[PDB]
């Protein structure tokens, strides 16, 4: 059962696995179904763009916080700063998320600009029903794409103050490690 110089393998097939095998024979069929469903939904919703406008947010975690992506919806504060109510925003094609909060001025200002540009690029048909026939744009994300914010200029002058970056990192670790013991010794005295 164990022979030769081979890696240790862990193949989890000791249950009735053959009863739960899923082969995606309908991969091509489902692609046709999704394309048909998108086409019939676009014809149903008039010239509406088939998707709602989304804000730009910072991804969490230290690993992914260097990038911005699309969030669920604009906050109540962002909607209010744009000059309209949340209820009217939902009926006009804007996603609203009540549980997200604003703590960064850069993110808040950018989402305010997105709402203002969106309002100036759409036409809202009156409730009377005359309904002038306008061409349908199938995507709002492509019309309003998300770009990573600029960080630094291409070239700049060298400014060295004589300090050491390695020394700065080492001292930062040391201060955090011994903060508790230093306070106790100071308090006991």
């Amino acid at each position: 059962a164990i022979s030769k110089n081979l890696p240790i393998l862990k193949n989890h097939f000791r249950k009735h696995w053959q009863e739960r095998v899923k082969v995606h024979f309908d991969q091509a069929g489902k692609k046709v179904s999704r394309r048909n469903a998108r086409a019939t939904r676009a014809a149903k919703i008039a010239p509406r763009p088939l998707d709602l406008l989304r804000p730009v947010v910072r991804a969490p975690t230290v690993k992914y916080n260097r990038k911005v992506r699309a969030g669920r919806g604009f906050t109540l504060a962002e909607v209010k700063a744009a000059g309209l109510t949340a209820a009217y925003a939902r009926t006009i094609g804007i996603a609203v998320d009540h549980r997200r909060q604003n703590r960064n001025q850069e993110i808040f200002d950018a989402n305010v600009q997105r709402l203002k540009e969106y309002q100036s690029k759409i036409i809202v048909f009156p409730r009377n029903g005359k309904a002038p026939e306008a061409e349908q744009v199938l995507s709002a994300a492509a019309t309003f794409p998300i770009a990573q914010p600029a960080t630094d200029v291409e070239a700049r002058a060298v400014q060295d103050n004589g300090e050491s970056a390695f020394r700065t990192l080492r001292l930062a670790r040391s201060e955090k490690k011994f903060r508790g013991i230093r306070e106790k010794r100071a308090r006991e005295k």
Binding site: K15, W17, R20, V21, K22, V23, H24, F25, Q27
Partner: protein, 136 residues
Amino acid sequence: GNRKRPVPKGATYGKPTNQGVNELKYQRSLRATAEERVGRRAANLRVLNSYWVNQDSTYKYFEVILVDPQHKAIRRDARYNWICDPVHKHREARGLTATGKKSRGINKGHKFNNTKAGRRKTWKRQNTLSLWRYRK
């Protein structure tokens, strides 16, 4: 009390780990048993909720709330005619009431990873082999 295993003379005919008879517990609460028996008694009604009232050493007492799906005061009421949908027949039997969902472990968070979306449904997803046309 507990649920004594209904085996003849205590014989289980198996391995020692399954030999227990006396100290076994029913996976559903006594409140769930109360609703189910009331549901069978009045099968023309729908179980909405129930609550504790009393208890002694032998019994626990409950009161069950029932709604008539045929009455016109219910069918014409917007806030309650959802119960008239056939998808809501015998909610207590499938554990769709408040006490049923607690026993099913239907809650959010890392503490309910086994039962968040349904224990058997989650187990099927995690024990399924997925193969594509162009094998990964």
